[PDB]
């Protein structure tokens with residue numbers, strides 16, 4: 001009844017999409033959401049509008065959109081809200097819930113320290 | 120004897136730099152590294168060359184550079200290695216060690232799920 005849509009920047013390179021694809025696989029393995037889709041802001045498919053429609057077509061009435069971005073920027077603040085139609089795509093009486101980016105989470109510091117030590 | 124340098128993209132907005140600043144502060148509280156510095160690839164100061172010199176000036180002989188990026192891209196594969204001189208003035212008794220980005224870590228999935236639930 002609710003869907004999770006992970007949105008990413010996109011790249012002319014393949015690494016950004018591979019990340020979102022792997023992230024969606026790992027989330028699916030956790031069996032929390034009925035529907036899970038990814039969309040990429042630029043350069044690649046699925047686009048963000050296509051992911052929201054796939055979710056709607058599978059029968060989701062609440063679409064949770066999580067920006068897989070570390071920090072806020074023009075994408076997360078302007079460009080993406082606009083694609084979702086949240087700022088001046090047909091949301092069919094469904095609710096889109098636009099979540100927060102990753103930010104300076106304690107678990108990021110944990111990751112950073114591992115990377116520093118080659119782990 | 121060794122320094123940790125966190126490098127980030129930079130932004131015409133203030134959100135990207137604040138993240139790196141909060142991240143540096145959190146790492147410093149862990150007391151693992153003698154010297155901790157941040158550098159921004161574009162738009163903002165400190166720049167990446169400035170951070171490596173600040174580190175050198177305090178007396179670091181090994182400079183661990185961690186890309187605070189989720190995925191590989193042209194910045195992490197070309198532009199940043201270039202600034203580090205890996206592909207300005209680097210003393211010979213000093214080595215730069217360029218680490219990996221965050222990637223599709225389990226701890227990221229954990230973060231994504233919290234964000235999905237508005238936590």
Ligand SMILES: O=C(O)CCC1=C(CC(=O)O)c2cc3[nH]c(cc4nc(cc5[nH]c(cc1n2)c(CC(=O)O)c5CCC(=O)O)C(CC(=O)O)=C4CCC(=O)O)c(CC(=O)O)c3CCC(=O)O
Pocket residue numbers: 009010011012013016072073074075128129130131132135188191192193194
């Ligand atoms: O003109 C060129 O192409 C050369 C420069 C260029 C390319 C690089 C290249 O292709 O050489 C580059 C590529 C990418 N940029 C990255 C990130 C973002 N760049 C920042 C700002 C924008 N940069 C744009 C252009 C450049 N975009 C524009 C114009 C536009 O996107 O519309 C602006 C927006 C300005 C506006 O519209 O007013 C922002 C926004 C912000 O931070 O606010 C961030 C995103 C958050 C962040 O990570 O900072 C990422 C993701 C990453 O790297 O993490 C990619 C893809 C991965 C990769 O690089 O493989």
